[PDB]
Design a protein around this ligand. Sequence first.
Ligand SMILES: [N-]=[N+]=N[C@]1(C(N)O)O[C@H](CO)[C@@H](O)[C@H](O)[C@H]1O
Ligand SMILES: [N-]=[N+]=N[C@]1(C(N)O)O[C@H](CO)[C@@H](O)[C@H](O)[C@H]1O
Ligand SMILES: *Cc1c(COP(=O)(O)O)cnc(C)c1O
Ligand SMILES: *Cc1c(COP(=O)(O)O)cnc(C)c1O
Lengths: 810, 810
Amino acid sequence: QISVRGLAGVENVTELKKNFNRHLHFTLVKDRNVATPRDYYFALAHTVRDHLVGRWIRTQQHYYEKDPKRIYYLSLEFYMGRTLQNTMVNLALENACDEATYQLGLDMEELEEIEEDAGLGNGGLGRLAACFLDSMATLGLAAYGYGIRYEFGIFNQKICGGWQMEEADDWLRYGNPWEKARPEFTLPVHFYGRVEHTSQGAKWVDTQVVLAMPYDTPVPGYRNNVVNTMRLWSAKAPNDFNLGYIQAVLDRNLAENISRVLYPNDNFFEGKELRLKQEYFVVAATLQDIIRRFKSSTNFDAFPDKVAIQLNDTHPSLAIPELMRVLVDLERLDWDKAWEVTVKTCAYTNHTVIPEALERWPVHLLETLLPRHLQIIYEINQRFLNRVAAAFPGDVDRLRRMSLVEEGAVKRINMAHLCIAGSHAVNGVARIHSEILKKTIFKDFYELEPHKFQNKTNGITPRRWLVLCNPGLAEIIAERIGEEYISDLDQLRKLLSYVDDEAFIRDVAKVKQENKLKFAAYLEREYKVHINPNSLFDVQVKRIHEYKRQLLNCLHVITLYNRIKKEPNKFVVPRTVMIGGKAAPGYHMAKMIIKLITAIGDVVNHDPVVGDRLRVIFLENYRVSLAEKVIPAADLSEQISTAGTEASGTGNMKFMLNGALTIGTMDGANVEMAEEAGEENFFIFGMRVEDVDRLDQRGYNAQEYYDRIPELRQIIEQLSSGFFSPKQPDLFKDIVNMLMHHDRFKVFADYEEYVKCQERVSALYKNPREWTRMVIRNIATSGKFSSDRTIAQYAREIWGVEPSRQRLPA
Amino acid sequence: QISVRGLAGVENVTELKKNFNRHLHFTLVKDRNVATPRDYYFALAHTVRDHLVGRWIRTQQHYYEKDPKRIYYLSLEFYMGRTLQNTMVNLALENACDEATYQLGLDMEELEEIEEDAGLGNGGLGRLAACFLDSMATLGLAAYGYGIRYEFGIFNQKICGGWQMEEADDWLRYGNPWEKARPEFTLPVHFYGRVEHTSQGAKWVDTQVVLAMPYDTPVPGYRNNVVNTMRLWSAKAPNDFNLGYIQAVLDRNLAENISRVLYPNDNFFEGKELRLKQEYFVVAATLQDIIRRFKSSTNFDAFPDKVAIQLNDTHPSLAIPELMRVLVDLERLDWDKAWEVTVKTCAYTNHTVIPEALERWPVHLLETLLPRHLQIIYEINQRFLNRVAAAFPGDVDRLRRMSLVEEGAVKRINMAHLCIAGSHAVNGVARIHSEILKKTIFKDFYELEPHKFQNKTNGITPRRWLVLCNPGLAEIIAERIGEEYISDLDQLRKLLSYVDDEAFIRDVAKVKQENKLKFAAYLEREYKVHINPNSLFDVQVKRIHEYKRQLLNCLHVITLYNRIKKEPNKFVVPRTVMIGGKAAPGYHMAKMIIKLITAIGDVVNHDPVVGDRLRVIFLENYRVSLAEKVIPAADLSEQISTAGTEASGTGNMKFMLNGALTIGTMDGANVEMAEEAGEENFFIFGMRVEDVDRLDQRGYNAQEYYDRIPELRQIIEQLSSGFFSPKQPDLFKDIVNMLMHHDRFKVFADYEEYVKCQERVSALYKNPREWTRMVIRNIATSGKFSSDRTIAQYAREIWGVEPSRQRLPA
Ligand SMILES: [N-]=[N+]=N[C@]1(C(N)O)O[C@H](CO)[C@@H](O)[C@H](O)[C@H]1O
Ligand SMILES: [N-]=[N+]=N[C@]1(C(N)O)O[C@H](CO)[C@@H](O)[C@H](O)[C@H]1O
Ligand SMILES: *Cc1c(COP(=O)(O)O)cnc(C)c1O
Ligand SMILES: *Cc1c(COP(=O)(O)O)cnc(C)c1O
């Protein structure tokens, strides 16, 4: 047992054991003679869950009595991952449960691997919402996460013949012990219908009703006895729905399809009706719940003082016109009063600037599905543009640029413009991203209302991303500076005075080595793959995207291979290059990149001359639980997006906190990370944002790089001739064609500096002691990237509430 | 507290209370400050459920150790109703729970009303399966009920404007505390595909796979610590199903629709593909489970010694060719050996002779959906007909009459012929029905294999149908003869010596009066209806069918009304005529009969001259839980089906056990009931089966009755002129037209004798003491109709197992 995992008290281990047996018997209805590891996992889950309820009930009763300002975090994604270990950590039950299960003759680690990941997210945005919930509970905020309970989360990725295959993520198959259905709080959500304009007000009539049933999941704070709630809505058809008879009952599934599956698109907008329905569904049900709770705390003037609604991207942007609809149509507030309340209540967070991710809904869709909302949006636009016109007289082009309504082929509603107009605060997720918003994408809006624009650099929770996934590192750190850093990451600074400590250097390096061995093992257990634990672990894990430039990584891998074949008997630092991540099902290029990766592995991993000096592995089904395994085992973190494309990134922070050195561009949060640790302790390379713009003025011509770089030329010719695809020589023609003629991300432009920088990485890896000292400098300055810091800033600068580290009663 | 409800021990009431609070807190995650009656209901349900698990686990472990012959009852319907009270009764926990909830300040009766009925049945057949499960557990048989877990059971009936409106029965909305999902025992079920004939055997290939997930529900025996299992299969799509991406996931619902809803047809065959899929689904999954269990007890010669499969009607008839398919195709047994095993394993129960209920599946359907099964069926037919030909040389018409394959418009498979050929026993459900089977419908089969044909008169469980729904009557009976009768109904005979006991007569009458007051109250509480508790309660509750002749009842009601209007100031015994029951959604005539009933009520209930002398009420949404309320309150039980159409009936038995006198035809079980009680203690009338046949030889002409009976003529003319439908004068033209020209059930032919008999009923009701004495004679001789007797006969004469009343350890 390690200290950070809590006490294994005599009374509590005994108590845990009997409750474990009580659940195995009464809850699972099994005896030890027929129980399987899955049954044991559930008995433990229910036992741990029991320890939450008491705190869950009093935390909620507490907010009712004290009635503080409530924070409502709206998101269509909550990438939670597993819940068992996280709950034990936050409740200081890990050692006790470890001991109790040991005495019962069970391996707790084995049982934890049985829990299904709650993959209700695509990547960064979804995981961010998960970390935020953890931090809000840890900071004692009366916060509620509101989303959709998808029956099927992000698809499970299978690699067949080197190609990605998708398969339904039936995560609820065996049940979810963490959620509590609350059918008694079901709410109606309306769709379609039409608008009637009577004397005293407008009415939305003849609508189709879909019921929203909530499921509450507890969110425990870190050892503070606070347990907040994540409420996920599930779609249910009313019983007089479609109510020949048999068909009517079977068609109920049409309404319930709303919460059936998560759209697997990462940073890509798909204007499908089902998606719009999901967006309104979560917004409509959530706002009724919010108002309900407010009325039970009718002057809505105090609404903004008791309520804060954070829009995680534009996905829940309809909350703005829906709030107006309720206040104006139902509560009968005058427009101006309602608008004042709405603006002071809502705050919007922008997560990316790439055009293809921007939500622009066709007017004909809103027209049919949400007719009243379209009218309200036009009215908002009208009044907003009148403000612009009055502020910039005669600037007609500004008017059309700022309109919420876009003209052209088909009229569309720019949801981002909607969010800015209806929110009192708009923030980017990293300093460079937030500046870009003010200088480019939202320049006009910044000029009209500069006070609205802020920055809130993303963060990650040190509980899941350090204590839970890397207990070995958390321990040696605790041995030196104590445990307070877990909820006050800035304290990692104190580790700076141990940078020359021989014992510490040895331990940091030991923990990393153990993590690598453990992962190298896992690799062979669950995926029959052998790798060399002494090689440098070069990993790039994140969603497959052209802007993330996994292709640039591929070019380097091929460069290393060609250099070896050129001078076989020359020494080179051994490397295990790991690339993982899912591609959206309809993203052809992303799928081709995955195939290219496996194809490279096919050649490189079986070339006798290469030996154990270079291995290319594609990490299958990258998800939260897998991230918890690879990140602690990584030596090199690849964050190589084209400058200006990765708003922030969060994977980068996870790697920094876990002892990996970072090679990357001055993009997103990488800029602040290098700033915190010192550029000398970072492997920075490539074009800066300014260089990218210069190149665009000039005109990006990939041919130029192809002509001046022999090594690069050789790689393109290998791809083109079928060197990596013998049976299908032209298999990668699309990739080559894109790289050569329409590469929006300038892969070639950063190639030279990238491989040069990679050489410096290998040189430092050859000096174990200095590599580790640089690692210590990174870990020691990663404190700023704790989501506790991020949330404390949202709380003070946007929501107007004070965080608190006070422990609620037992 | 009453004695039959068990002891309210000090230690147990205290234990019940803390467990109730434990579940309210830990299971429901609620505090007393926000708990609602529904929450309290669930805390109690979970508390009671806890007492079952221990016994459930040891009963099953017990069967594993002793390895007795297993009884598998296959049914597409299990009309369970509520489970809470039934479980308390069988566990002797009712008084303890009553006391415990009282001390917690709660009314247990109020909480019981919150439980949703498990309406996985249409009527008789489904309820029979429910009573059988209870009796099998009570008789200590290693029995398993196998069916489908429909998401939506029989529809909830609403009456709008006097018309039936159907609405989804979302019985799982708030959850089901009684079931235990067993995803770990999921089994694959195949559909479509084609048949490949290789060297060593035929193969069913290229099939579509649907997963069958089981849900186990405990079935407690009466105070014997035996808890059997009812396993209901749920359809689940495999995860690589349909696996653009979004659509594939959404289409998963196509496979899962198999267990979505119960076909609401009572005694009516609808040849829909979805229905056939349900039938094979339950059969395929069940047989794999059966074999699996057998192999874990490979000579299948002992299979019939360890396994008995009872086919509840022909719905699960595919079990015969499916068993053959597995034994021949998979286990590789020779045809003849496999057939021997199949016949000795299967037994079939026929429930009705009406042609429209007979399952005749089109060959093109089986051809596409189950190609291998069709081949096996042809092979079975071939070999069966060769036996017929050898037994009746030259009788060519017999060959075509007995074929499993019917020629004509479209070829069809007669599933009933299939069941007879592949079963070692075939039984009817009442003596007269079973005789009819041998003399008519299955005469040819009886001639070929007389040994196969048996009778097993239906029964009802005295636990739910006496102790649970009529505790007052069970008590006064127990006060005289003890409690042993509850599991040995024949003991009610002893009540015969109390027929002249003044105290008993007074009590029997008192209990009935209390039941009537309680129901008259319930009527006003949940349906705003006032009735006179002193009137005779004339009730007919069962599914709406033309053969049940609710119309004959209607004619009598109108006769009574016309007679009153004719001589207003003449005295007549007051009556409250209650008719209830659901009509299949597509059964037009049944729906018109419901409207006619309400229409009569509209006129009769508001005629000042009638006063409180006659009331016509239509009991809305008749279901099991409602039956438990009306039956104990009834004075007169209407069992007036045309002789030869009601195979048995079971409602009739429920009324007899509960103190109601019976007016009915010599049909189904009515014949044995009158035989047991004595015809003098029964109100028998109308044509006997022989009279019906004579009339058919002759030719049924309704006009004749219309011409010779003035009162009948007046009624038809009232219906025709719009007397009961002012706004829509021709509203009942279909009814009149049917009665006059195409009445298959000869309503007019029994009219005269029916009203005459009804007059005798009223005369006896005028003499309270003698009416009650006749009631005692009925209750005292109802013992034979206990499903314990029925099951003991199935056990000994069909399954080859001995029932046992031995109590398993605690
Ligand atoms: N939605 N969105 N965009 C992202 C993402 N999910 O990847 O949001 C994440 C959370 O803000 C950012 O770190 C990331 O750079 C940005 O591209
Ligand atoms: N299926 N079927 N037929 C019936 C029914 N459900 O009503 O089976 C019941 C159970 O055997 C019989 O009592 C009844 O007379 C017969 O019509
Ligand atoms: C943290 C995380 C991400 C975000 O990673 P980036 O490299 O910022 O894109 C995506 N997926 C998972 C499973 C994560 O844990
Ligand atoms: C017993 C019962 C039946 C069968 O009644 P019959 O009069 O034999 O048709 C039908 N429905 C319910 C709810 C029952 O309890």
